[PDB]
């Protein structure tokens, strides 16, 4: 299977998911000087008031959180979507050091995680049929870096024992993925792809200007998560981010000047 690792991780990708290669593949840099701003772009609205979680899992890559998809209740609209896009799950790309962990990096820049919040366009009915439009998914993508601990994610930090290895799953429920945002809505947009196989280009990805701080102690926590399933020789859960592939044929919008 895929992974992170020398023998199997984004540098042979390619040889089971030829669309690696594609011309809009994810994550990129984002060149500040370059990213045209785009007075067109209407703001974001994020409505997570209703949303539902479910449950956590370790999925022997990162730990997705999962939430209720069955109605309008956790929507993204606004900005360069037109429709609605339902929220499903949101994980985390993290570094074995404070350093690295980011997928997209701003000037080449790299932060110490990015969060990435999941969303499907209703007008195709299910997150199956979504992941393949071309304007299936919206991924809101945010970056991590280490300074004071963000209150909002603790509650998510506190039950990662309960999921330590691939397969375990843990009852999620009254999460608010509204604690884990950022205070302005600023962004940069670009049509692109999921970072893990299948690498489907179905994706218009919103990453946020401002990153939220979260505390050194918290993302150890993340760092204690193991690849491997119960039983088997443990390898730590660190470094589970694609790096940044070319921009090819895209330009790359901002919202704000
Ligand atoms: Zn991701």
Redesign the pocket.
Same mark, same amino acid.
């Given at each position: 299977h895929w992974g992170y690792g020398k023998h199997n991780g984004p540098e042979h990708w390619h040889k089971d998911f030829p669309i690696a290669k594609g011309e809009r593949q994810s994550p990129v840099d984002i060149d500040t000087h370059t990213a045209k701003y785009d007075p067109s772009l209407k703001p974001l609205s994020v409505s997570y008031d209703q949303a539902t979680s479910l449950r956590i899992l370790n999925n022997g890559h990162?730990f997705n959180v999962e939430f209720d998809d069955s109605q309008d209740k956790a929507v993204l609209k606004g900005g360069p979507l037109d429709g609605t896009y339902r929220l499903i799950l949101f994980?985390f !790309?993290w570094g074995s050091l404070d350093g690295q962990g980011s997928?997209h990096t701003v000037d080449k820049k790299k932060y110490a995680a990015?969060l !990435?919040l999941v969303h499907w366009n209703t007008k195709y009915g299910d997150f199956g049929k979504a992941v393949q439009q071309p304007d299936g998914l919206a991924?809101l993508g945010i970056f991590l870096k280490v300074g004071s601990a963000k209150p909002g994610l603790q509650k998510v930090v506190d039950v990662l024992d309960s999921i330590k290895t691939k397969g375990k799953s843990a009852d999620f429920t009254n999460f608010d993925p509204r604690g884990l945002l950022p205070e302005s809505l600023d962004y940069w947009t670009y049509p692109g792809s999921?970072?893990?196989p299948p690498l489907l280009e179905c994706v218009t990805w919103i990453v946020l200007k401002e990153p939220i701080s979260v505390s050194s102690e918290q993302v150890l926590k993340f760092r204690k998560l193991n690849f491997n399933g119960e039983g088997e020789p443990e390898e730590l859960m660190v470094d589970n981010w694609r790096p940044a592939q070319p921009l090819k044929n895209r330009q790359i919008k901002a919202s704000f000047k």
């Open positions: 990162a994980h !790309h997928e990015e !990435h991924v999921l970072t893990t």
